[PDB]
Amino acid sequence: TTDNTFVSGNCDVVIGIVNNTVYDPLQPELDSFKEELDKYFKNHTSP
Amino acid sequence: IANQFNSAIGKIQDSLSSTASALGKLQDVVNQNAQALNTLVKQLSSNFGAISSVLNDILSRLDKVEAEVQIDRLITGRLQSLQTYVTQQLIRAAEIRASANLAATKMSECVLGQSKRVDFCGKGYHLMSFPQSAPHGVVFLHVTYVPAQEKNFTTAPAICHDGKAHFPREGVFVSNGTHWFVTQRNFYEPQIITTDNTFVSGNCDVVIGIVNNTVYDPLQPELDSFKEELDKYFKNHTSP
Amino acid sequence: VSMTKTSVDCTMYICGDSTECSNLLLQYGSFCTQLNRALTGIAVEQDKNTQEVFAQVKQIYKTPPIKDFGGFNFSQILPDPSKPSKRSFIEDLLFNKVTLADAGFIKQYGDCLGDIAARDLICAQKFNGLTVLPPLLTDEMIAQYTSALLAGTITSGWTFGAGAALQIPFAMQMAYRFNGIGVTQNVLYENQKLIANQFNSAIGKIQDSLSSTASALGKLQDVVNQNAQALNTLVKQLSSNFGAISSVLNDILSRLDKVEAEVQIDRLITGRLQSLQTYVTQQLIRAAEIRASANLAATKMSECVLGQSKRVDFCGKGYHLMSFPQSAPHGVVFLHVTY
Amino acid sequence: SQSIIAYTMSLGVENSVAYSNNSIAIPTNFTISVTTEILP
Ligand SMILES: *[C@@H]1O[C@H](CO)[C@@H](O[C@@H]2O[C@H](CO)[C@@H](O[C@H]3O[C@H](CO)[C@@H](O)[C@H](O)[C@@H]3O)[C@H](O)[C@H]2NC(C)=O)[C@H](O)[C@H]1NC(C)=O
Ligand SMILES: *[C@@H]1O[C@H](CO)[C@@H](O[C@@H]2O[C@H](CO)[C@@H](O[C@H]3O[C@H](CO)[C@@H](O)[C@H](O)[C@@H]3O)[C@H](O)[C@H]2NC(C)=O)[C@H](O)[C@H]1NC(C)=O
Ligand SMILES: *[C@@H]1O[C@H](CO)[C@@H](O[C@@H]2O[C@H](CO)[C@@H](O[C@H]3O[C@H](CO)[C@@H](O)[C@H](O)[C@@H]3O)[C@H](O)[C@H]2NC(C)=O)[C@H](O)[C@H]1NC(C)=O
Ligand SMILES: *[C@@H]1O[C@H](CO)[C@@H](O[C@@H]2O[C@H](CO)[C@@H](O[C@H]3O[C@H](CO)[C@@H](O)[C@H](O)[C@@H]3O)[C@H](O)[C@H]2NC(C)=O)[C@H](O)[C@H]1NC(C)=O
Ligand SMILES: *[C@@H]1O[C@H](CO)[C@@H](O[C@@H]2O[C@H](CO)[C@@H](O[C@H]3O[C@H](CO)[C@@H](O)[C@H](O)[C@@H]3O)[C@H](O)[C@H]2NC(C)=O)[C@H](O)[C@H]1NC(C)=O
Ligand SMILES: *[C@@H]1O[C@H](CO)[C@@H](O[C@@H]2O[C@H](CO)[C@@H](O[C@H]3O[C@H](CO)[C@@H](O)[C@H](O)[C@@H]3O)[C@H](O)[C@H]2NC(C)=O)[C@H](O)[C@H]1NC(C)=O
Ligand SMILES: *[C@@H]1O[C@H](CO[C@@H]2O[C@@H](C)[C@@H](O)[C@@H](O)[C@@H]2O)[C@@H](O[C@@H]2O[C@H](CO)[C@@H](O)[C@H](O)[C@H]2NC(C)=O)[C@H](O)[C@H]1NC(C)=O
Ligand SMILES: *[C@@H]1O[C@H](CO)[C@@H](O)[C@H](O)[C@H]1NC(C)=O
Ligand SMILES: *[C@@H]1O[C@H](CO)[C@@H](O)[C@H](O)[C@H]1NC(C)=O
Ligand SMILES: *[C@@H]1O[C@H](CO)[C@@H](O)[C@H](O)[C@H]1NC(C)=O
Ligand SMILES: *[C@@H]1O[C@H](CO)[C@@H](O)[C@H](O)[C@H]1NC(C)=O
């Protein structure tokens, strides 16, 4: 994760680097807020 | 910290202006070389069983043949007096060497650096040291942080909050008996227990002595103020 | 940490109860004062070495009566009230496993004439003018300094070395240790019963090992044997003629006139004075090794007991957590605890 | 009114530490100490 790791530079310079995902814990904490906002906007179409 | 340092350098200056015996480490090393030489001069008064200790008195009062028998005694005795002095000086030199290698190690590790070695660069936690010359030696003024005015607190190895168990990232948990905080280990500066101050591992069934307190998430009031912003914006959008 | 302090009466060794020999010995000048002074210098230094190794605390820490150390069982290395000196269980093995030739504690003659004189050699050393002097800190006061260091260590972590003793729960001290070896403190708490049961079992292996094999304490026993062999050798040299008519000072005086006796006596004076100068040189060279060992032991007391060491292989094999000092005859045993 | 006394030496002042499975002491303040050390 972004808490467990730090970033410097691009992937070209590091000998032996591997591709893998690095998870951001802020993303799904805001994605439930996107699904909350989406259901709130769609509910505001009903009255 | 500057006033305490400036005052402590003042106490060194007054202490060195007052007592004699503190430099005994160096004065004894001068006294031992002086005593060894005074003793080696005194041995020129011993007869060693010759008719006289004075070499000219032997050579002037006796002819060649019995003079060799008297002089050989003074040679044999004096030569053992030199071998005693030189053996003793090699053993002292071996001590002074060990003290010089210790002093070179303290110059490297206390002056040119900072030491994690307990009680090596003086008593207390080492900050830095200043070398000073002295006759046949070195004086180190070690500067050390000593923790001074302790208070008791209740403590716990971990906090349980959201069923999960939390531990300090650095420092320790404390309570005044009503609230809980993290603080750094070596100085009391309490802070609210948070998801930045602490790291999470496992559930709170396994940790002996874990305690219940809230662990604050500093992102929650960012999103919740952004929710009261969004709620007033939705409420307003009912009006036009 | 130390060795037996010895004083040798140079006049009584060379010239035992003869004034004829004493008046000849004065012709050799200040040598007996140099010998007395050198052995005094060694004897003073054995207390200094013991102060530097054990007296690293100005306060004597007493352990609480309750033993709530998070499951770690120090009862083998803490004192017990049941014994008339406050030694631990492991220290009472150490004081039995090194045989101590002459402690110096009062030869009242009722112990040193008669039946015992036909089997004890220490009385012959004493009667020839060789005397072993007691340490300033007896095995009770060394046990109290070791108790205070250990009580401070299990109750207060490293802080009693830096300043005041600040209490901390033992399972939190062990967590501060784990963070010191780069292992995250949750690894202690998620395994605390295992880590305690392993420490308790490892202290059990120390107890059984010390109960079983002799050779491990050879580091201390051979320091006692060297000082004992050096003094037995110095007593044996009183049997040598050095080319005189006799090994016995009274026999030479029982049979020769003043002018001829002095030529036999000064042979024994010259040979015995070499025999002392060999012994004193050898003891100064031994003292220089024991000193280096006492400075190493003082450095391990400071860095392994009063602290936690990042220095590889200095405080035991493995990553250092903590160490517990234990007293021994002329020595210190460190129980290094390592991850 | 002065003379040679003789005594068993004190090792240091006795100081039992206030231990508990849940008690910690933390320093609210510090003193910078300067100490001289002298080596031949
Ligand atoms: C890890 O993943 C990377 C992207 O997911 C990947 O990089 C991609 O590599 C390919 C092949 O080198 C590139 O394809 C381009 O190749 C040349 C130009 O360089 C052209 O002929 C092609 O038409 C095409 O443009 C991708 O553009 C490149 N993309 C990225 C984002 O890097 C790495 O190769 C992967 N690493 C490993 C070890 O497989
Ligand atoms: C344990 O630590 C707590 C945090 O420092 C402390 O609680 C805090 O106490 C102060 C008062 O001493 C409160 O300050 C407020 O007090 C009144 C409230 O009406 C106001 O007039 C003041 O302006 C000020 O706002 C803090 O609000 C309070 N914090 C909390 C979260 O309650 C405890 O007192 C400490 N307990 C002990 C036993 O020492
Ligand atoms: C710390 O806070 C915890 C959460 O509030 C609290 O845990 C709760 O403890 C009670 C009592 O042990 C549990 O109640 C259940 O107990 C048994 C089943 O285990 C049943 O007889 C009961 O009907 C009931 O189901 C709660 O389930 C438990 N909650 C959770 C989420 O585990 C701790 O007790 C608190 N501890 C301290 C020292 O404050
Ligand atoms: C801390 O570790 C100690 C060493 O293992 C342990 O002491 C030992 O305790 C056992 C159990 O009582 C003793 O075993 C004897 O116990 C009774 C004596 O009447 C008998 O029923 C048994 O057959 C057996 O003879 C050990 O002898 C004893 N060892 C010593 C040196 O005292 C402590 O109990 C441990 N304490 C904790 C809190 O774990
Ligand atoms: C990490 O290493 C530990 C050893 O240092 C190991 O602990 C040992 O675990 C086994 C079980 O896996 C226990 O075995 C005994 O269990 C009972 C008696 O209590 C008996 O039924 C068994 O026949 C056997 O005698 C050991 O007692 C236990 N040792 C200790 C000191 O507790 C851990 O299992 C290892 N952990 C991991 C995660 O690998
Ligand atoms: C941390 O310890 C400090 C001592 O090393 C302490 O500083 C001392 O604070 C007192 C006041 O609380 C000062 O007392 C003097 O104040 C004036 C003169 O400046 C006079 O009117 C008073 O009669 C009295 O003599 C000390 O001079 C001061 N010492 C230093 C070196 O600054 C701190 O207060 C302590 N800090 C905390 C947070 O406890
Ligand atoms: C830290 O606590 C110890 C002992 O525990 C406390 O004992 C009560 C006084 C009360 O505060 C309890 O809630 C605590 O558990 C204090 O040690 C005592 O100090 C006094 C002198 O001030 C002394 O007469 C007692 O014999 C001590 N008792 C023990 C058990 O050692 C200590 O003073 C506290 N530290 C600070 C800085 O306040
Ligand atoms: C590791 O060595 C192998 C050959 O044994 C090679 O194919 C591979 O590319 C090397 N990887 C790196 C990161 O150097
Ligand atoms: C939709 O909004 C109305 C209020 O305007 C509320 O009564 C209703 O329960 C909402 N439904 C959902 C699914 O949020
Ligand atoms: C601490 O000790 C007390 C008994 O004095 C006990 O009641 C309590 O449960 C213990 N807590 C821990 C975490 O060991
Ligand atoms: C409501 O939205 C309109 C946008 O036309 C704006 O003029 C008005 O000031 C808003 N009121 C609040 C309370 O945001």
Numbering used by the authors:
A (entry chain C): 1116 to 1162
B (entry chain A): 923 to 1162
C (entry chain C): 729 to 1067
D (entry chain A): 689 to 728
Which sentences did the original study use to describe this structure?
SARS-CoV-2 is an enveloped positive-stranded RNA virus that depends on fusion of viral and target cell membranes to enter a host cell. This first key step of infection is catalyzed by the virus-encoded trimeric spike (S) protein, which is also a major surface antigen and thus an important target for development of diagnostics, vaccines, and therapeutics. The RBD can adopt two distinct conformations: “up” for a receptor-accessible state and “down” for a receptor-inaccessible state. We have previously identified two structural elements, the FPPR (fusion peptide proximal region) and the 630 loop, which appear to modulate the S protein stability as well as the RBD conformation and thus the receptor accessibility. In this study, we have characterized the full-length S proteins from the B.1.1.7 and B.1.351 variants and determined their structures by cryo–electron microscopy (cryo-EM), providing a structural basis for understanding the molecular mechanisms of the enhanced infectivity of B.1.1.7 and the immune evasion of B.1.351.
3D classification identified five distinct classes for the B.1.1.7 S trimer—representing one closed prefusion conformation, three one-RBD-up conformations, and one two-RBD-up conformation—and two different classes for the B.1.351 trimer, representing a closed conformation and a one-RBD-up conformation. The two classes for the B.1.351 S trimer represent the closed prefusion and one-RBD-up states, respectively. In the B.1.351 virus, the S protein largely retains the structure of the G614 trimer with almost identical biochemical stability. Three mutations—K417N, E484K, and N501Y—at the ACE2 binding site do not produce any major structural rearrangements. The most notable differences are in the NTD, which contains three point mutations [L18F(Leu18→Phe), D80A (Asp80→Ala), and D215G (Asp215→Gly)] and a three-residue deletion (L242del, A243del, and L244del). The most consequential changes are probably from the triple-residue deletion, because these nonpolar residues, located on the edge of the NTD core structure formed by four stacking β sheets, are replaced with polar residues His245-Arg246-Ser247. This replacement causes a shift of the nearby loop (residues 144 to 155) and must also reconfigure the adjacent disordered loop (residues 246 to 260), both of which form part of the NTD neutralizing epitopes. The triple-residue deletion rearranges the 172-to-188 segment with a movement up to 17 Å (Leu180). By substantially altering the conformational preferences of this component of the molecular surface, these mutations likely affect binding of any antibody that has part of its footprint in this region. By contrast, the B.1.351 variant completely lost binding to the two RBD-2 antibodies, G32B6 and C12A2, as well as to the two NTD-1 antibodies, C12C9 and C83B6, whereas the affinities for the rest of the antibodies were the same as those of the G614 trimer.
